[PDB]
# Entry
Amino acid sequence: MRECISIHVGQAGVQIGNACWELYCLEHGIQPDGQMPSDKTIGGGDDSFNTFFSETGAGKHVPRAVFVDLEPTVIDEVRTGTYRQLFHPEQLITGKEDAANNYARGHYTIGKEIIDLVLDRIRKLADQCTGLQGFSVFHSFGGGTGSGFTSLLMERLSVDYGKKSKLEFSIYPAPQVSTAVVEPYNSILTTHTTLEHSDCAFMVDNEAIYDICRRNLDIERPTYTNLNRLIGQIVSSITASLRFDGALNVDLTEFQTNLVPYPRAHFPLATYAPVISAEKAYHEQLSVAEITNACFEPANQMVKCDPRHGKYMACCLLYRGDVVPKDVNAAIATIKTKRTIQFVDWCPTGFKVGINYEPPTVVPGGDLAKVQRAVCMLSNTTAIAEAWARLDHKFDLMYAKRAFVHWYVGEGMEEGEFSEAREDMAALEKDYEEVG
Amino acid sequence: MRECISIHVGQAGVQIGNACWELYCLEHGIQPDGQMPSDKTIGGGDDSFNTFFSETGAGKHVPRAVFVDLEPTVIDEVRTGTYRQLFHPEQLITGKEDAANNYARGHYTIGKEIIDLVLDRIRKLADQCTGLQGFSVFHSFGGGTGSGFTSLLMERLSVDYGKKSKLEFSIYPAPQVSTAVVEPYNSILTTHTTLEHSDCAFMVDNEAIYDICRRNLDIERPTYTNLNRLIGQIVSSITASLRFDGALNVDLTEFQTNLVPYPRAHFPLATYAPVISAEKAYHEQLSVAEITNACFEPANQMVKCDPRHGKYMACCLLYRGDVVPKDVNAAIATIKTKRTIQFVDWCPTGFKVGINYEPPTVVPGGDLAKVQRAVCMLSNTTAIAEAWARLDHKFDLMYAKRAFVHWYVGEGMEEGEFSEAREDMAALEKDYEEVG
Amino acid sequence: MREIVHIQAGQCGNQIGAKFWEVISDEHGIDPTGSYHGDSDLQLERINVYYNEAAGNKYVPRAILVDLEPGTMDSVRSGPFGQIFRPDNFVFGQSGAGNNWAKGHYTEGAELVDSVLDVVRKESESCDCLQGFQLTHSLGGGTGSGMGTLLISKIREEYPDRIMNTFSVVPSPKVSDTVVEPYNATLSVHQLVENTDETYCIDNEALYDICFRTLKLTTPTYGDLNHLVSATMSGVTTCLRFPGQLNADLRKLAVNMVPFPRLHFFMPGFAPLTSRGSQQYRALTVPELTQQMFDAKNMMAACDPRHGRYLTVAAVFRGRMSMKEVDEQMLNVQNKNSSYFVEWIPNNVKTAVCDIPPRGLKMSATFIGNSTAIQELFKRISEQFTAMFRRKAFLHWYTGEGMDEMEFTEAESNMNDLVSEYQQYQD
Amino acid sequence: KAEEKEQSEKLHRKLQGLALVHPLPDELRKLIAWDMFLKPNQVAFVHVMHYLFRLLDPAEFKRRFFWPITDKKSEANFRSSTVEYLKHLNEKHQLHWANIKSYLVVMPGGMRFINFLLEFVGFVIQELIKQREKSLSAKVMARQNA
# Structure
């Protein structure tokens, strides 16, 4: 088997994780107690879901997950919620004191007290794997636990598991939903320290998700529950090739090999279609050609940038549900003739296409309609550097006056680490420009 | 396929459109929910109605229509009425503020805020067409949205779709049903700006329809619902060659080629027979010879003029229902010997004859009787210039004193545009005189 | 766990502190006997922050009541919630401070301070993970001002790594007991600058003008002023007392709100403004709450925020509302008024929402602003101080307790240095 | 009408004199005329008051007023603040200005307004004289200097 361990770090990672695991249970027919009543195979049926679940000797399917937060509040909601019986109590790790929106407190101070406990719990899950592939880490760039504890964890995972792939699902901070002023600092510091440890990182801009919920779901003011349900569909579409029998991206190493030509340029732009409100569920079903054309509209992207200002290094189209390869090829040919799609000269103008026949599932009473077919486009494009430049500009404005720096130095972080992290981000922006 | 997009602009265009689409659904056996229960062909049956309808993946037939008004009131009646489920919500476009019976407000001010949204919705319907023929635009000359927004739309359609035919169904203003004093100005301004963009425009004089409803239907005071039901039968008889298998006017380009010898003289006179009250439905059925002879009576024309004071450049007879070609030829021979029918010397004294065997349908509980046979005569005649001279005379009387001009100048229109539009109308009157 | 130790010092501190405990006990469903009678598990989930569990499922405030005279503390013990407090935590003198900071700091309070620290230690030793301390006091009096700052300095000596927060009532000539209030206030502000991480500036001028001009009370009492303070204190502490998206502690708040170690003086605000016993039948909308919380008329420091810039802002919304509408309105205020926020601190406005509204409201908003406009409050105290100090007026009350005139000159200069530091970051 | 003209000219002279010591901003320079308040002139009012307040106490002006005026709201605020500041000055310096009412600020113009402004300008000039006296024929000075 080819097992994957999911790690959910801080409030954002835990809340996204909780929404993703609800959706995985619904897609595999697992009940909130971990029972699977359609599983007539007391033994090895379609063993593909054993990538993310472990069967216990009581017929209970338990997630290969660890949840970590430095405060108890968000994990206590998981311990008391609908899926409280799904997880083992040892997988739900809580500190007493939080990182207070400070990277340095999350990395050096409070993170150092809890890290060895987290690594012991991860090791207990790794020891239950016959062929551990890697890790999927869920966190926020802006929050102190999501930044500082994740960098410390990613370093220690590279030491203990240096041949195992590490995928990230990172929440990029947005002003409209932002809880801290220092979110740019936390984001630059964590991106610098995780850059050499990540094999592939899926950025999710909260501003992009918020605008999709407003425009496509008609929600005047999206909550984190609305955002996390949409994020859960994208994450489910990315992981669907690892959870079900399929032809493309059947392991974590295939993601790096298909999407990441250069080790530093490991940030694929995700785009998901269709996003339709549950009230519009009885409308005309979108064709394969319409949903594929919606992947090249900036209004449906997971990061706010314009791929028309950059180049494509790689492009993967992951279809789910009622999709035939003939109609996909006809859609791609129509898109290549009508759209400005500039690939880089040294990379083949090739789309990798995955089709999983399992239709998209939606959470009952969620904001999303049941659709017959969906597509997730994963594209490595130089236009994602527009998100780095926006973060770097906010960093530079505050750092030029040393605003808030004393909170990080007060936790024992050196002022030089800000300059080093900013220099590495300037090198990353230049790497993207030289490729573009 | 050979698809057509209908565009309904302002109160008059929307209300006529609503009556036409009700009648089309009845003629094709489509229910108000868009279901077609006789359609055993889950696939391509008599594909002729796919010219005006698009099949959705749920077996629902949706009109290839866009409705546009600068106020919500009239389109909200469509959203709440019997056919509320027929249309897609994206096809029903509403502003907040109207054009207040001013061409300049409809063209320059409020029209400019909504035009790009309307063109995006038209493009989404055009992208669903395999072989878009053209557009059929329904509007009023007298009303501010029907004049000013239609001219702006027709210009932009000529830019985006410059090889696609554009047909107009234009309501000519009548004093007895007229809501504004400035209707002559709005009519001259819109006719000037649409003249180079239209391929063929069917004028409908509200005074002619009102008098037909009074004389033939015994309705003492016709409402817009009575007028629009009669207009819907004429429009249905004109479009019947595009909606059903038939030998004559099978495309939009054949209308121009058969009716429009000169690009500026593109206003065919429509005449419809028989118009009979539903109370007289059990009377003796009119012969082919009687209904053809009724097409040469000014009392049954759609524009108040006398074709005996002018010449015919073209004449088309479109029959529906129980009609044999032998009886049509015998009727035409009797008419040529008994009637003053002067054709122009350079054009053949030829009638084009279309016969569609599908009988005329009438709206249940409407004012019109079910008839076994009907005829629509489309004739390009110089006597239609009598309608221009009546409009020009009313324009000149008000414009000589600059009455109401300040309302148009207050919206940023130049006073010179009135003189330019009036000069182009004087050139059109002269073109009709030189041919006559 | 994440515990806080509360201290209330002198007459004003004990009166406001008693009202704070009454308000939060009711929000947590705790009766005057310490018994729970609530209907939601969310009322108990973080109760240990402010309460100790006692035998028989009783909740006892982690509160220490300090005065140099018994009169206010006997009034608290006879009050509606007077029996909920641990009896051992009533630490009092007999001599009183006589509105003299030197008596509170150097003499009468220096005899009592060790007995207060023994109770502080006994409460702190019972915590699993002490976050820090909160003090309620007035800067105009003797006990709250002088003994309160002595206690802060001694707590910082014994617990140097723990957060120290204060709810500091600033004196005003409109609501004045004695002419020496500017002396007591200047001497205490100097001690707060060095020894606190967070100081909520509660101006009696602003409270009086809110009660009089906004609430239409023709003769505001200290009971009407303390109603506003207790509502604001409930608002500010909401993210510590209830679960939410921000699992807040005192250190995360300080790290987000304090860019410079000396510039920790906050302007608190509350919306909607209500008077005691007046039922608002109309719930405000989110736009009306967001507009009111940024209005100078809802601020409890008598400064105009338009005369300065915001370094940092925290906004706490309470009640069932669209979180999307909250973000849209908060961004609308920032984008329209961006000149009043410093540009060199990116994303310096943080927003939290809690589903549990305060009693008698469906929705409320609490505002916390670190603004350079707070310098107006210190300038106003400085002018009143210098007006008397230039004549050595009333100094014999302090020099009789052993104070030097040089201690006054140092406190005046340190307060002028704080005003200059706020002006530097304004420009 | 004759008296109104005379007072307006006197006002103009005083403003011209002030401009010799303290130059007028460009916006105000174009507005300055002997008859600028014979009719209600809101635009001149705003700039003249702005000029005089800055001469009197720039710091206090910065504290009380927002400048430049960009919208209707800001303009209304400027008027209100003007009335408030004038009242404050009246009290502080005991100038005994009667009827500092909203009308001075709503339709600035006419005899009543011109008289008021003359008094105000007089006050400003007096304050400046005091400052100059502390710090310390035109034809003879000119010749001697040459």
